Amino acid sequence: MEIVEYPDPILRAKNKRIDIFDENLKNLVDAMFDVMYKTDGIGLSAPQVGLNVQLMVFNPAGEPGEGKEIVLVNPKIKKYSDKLVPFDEGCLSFPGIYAEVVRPQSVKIDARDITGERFSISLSRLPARIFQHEYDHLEGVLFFDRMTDQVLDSIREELEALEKKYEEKTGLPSPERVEA
Ligand SMILES: [Zn+2]
Ligand SMILES: [Zn+2]
Ligand SMILES: [Zn+2]
Ligand SMILES: [Zn+2]
Ligand SMILES: [Zn+2]
């Protein structure tokens, strides 16, 4: 079972709204949570485990038996804060790659829960940073799309190696290329 790594086109594809709320959505969200705790995250979006659907699991404490298990379906960031902060972002789809991304410090979010009802939430500090990172995945946006041209330069070669690994693994052209 798997984290999808750049340049896999799964990580760029349209993610489909969820209209069906059943045993299946439930059992997939548990799987996602458990990968999240496996890999010590605060948030995990569906495209990262290979399903192109607008589903995210979140635990703002990001540890077992702490925080709350929040399930966000069809989420929408309504508002972004106006204060920007720089933070060293990583991403499981780019193993070992970390680099400065500047982003809004807080956000507010409408989404839908596991049975189908709408809730909203405001986020700040690490939770907001992580939520924005994973929300981007739902919108087919990767963290390097957010980096300055200076900062990307520092990771271009490490992204090229991921490109080459993809071409090795799956004998085809990397479908996207940082050199773009
Ligand atoms: Zn669990
Ligand atoms: Zn931890
Ligand atoms: Zn992630
Ligand atoms: Zn990521
Ligand atoms: Zn090159």
- Can you spell out the DSSP letters for 140-159? T--GGGGS-HHHHHHHHHHH
CA dist., res. 166 & res. 129, Å (int): 28
CA of 1 to the centre of ligand 4 (A): 17
Q: Which amino acid is residue 128, in one-letter code?
A: A
32 in Cβ contact with 57 (< 8 Å): yes
Residues recorded for the chain? 180
Only one residue has tokens 């300055």, namely 148
Is residue 163 helix, strand or coil? helix
134 in Cβ contact with 45 (< 8 Å): yes
95: left (phi over 0), alpha (psi -120 to 50) or beta: beta
State the alpha helices, DSSP H only, in 13-148: 23-39, 125-138
CA dist., res. 54 & res. 41, Å (int): 18
106 in Cβ contact with 128 (< 8 Å): yes
CA dist., res. 80 & res. 106, Å (int): 6
Q: Which element (helix H / strand E) includes 103?
A: strand 99-104
Please indicate the experimental technique that yielded this structure: X-ray
CA dist., res. 134 & res. 108, Å (int): 14
**Structural tokens at position 158:** 């490490």
104 in Cβ contact with 84 (< 8 Å): yes
Residue 177 half-sphere exposure toward CB, CA atoms < 13 A: 8
CA of 126 to the centre of ligand 4 (A): 14
Please indicate whether residue 167 is annotated as part of the active site.
no
State the binding site for Fe cation. Answer: 91, 133, 137
**CA dihedral sign, ordered 16, 50, 106, 86:** negative
Residue 114 half-sphere exposure toward CB, CA atoms < 13 A: 13
Q: Which amino acid is residue 123, in one-letter code?
A: L
110 in Cβ contact with 78 (< 8 Å): yes
Only one residue has tokens 């925080």, namely 67
> Which ligand lies nearest to the CA atom of residue 45 in the structure?
3
CA dist., res. 6 & res. 12, Å (int): 9
> Which CATH number applies to 1-180: 3.30.450.30, 3.90.45.10, 3.40.50.1240, 1.10.10.10?
3.90.45.10
51 in Cβ contact with 35 (< 8 Å): no
Is residue 57 helix, strand or coil? strand
**CA dihedral sign, ordered 61, 63, 69, 72:** positive
Backbone angles phi, psi at 2, to 5 degrees: -150, 140
Q: What is the resolution of this structure in A?
A: 2.0
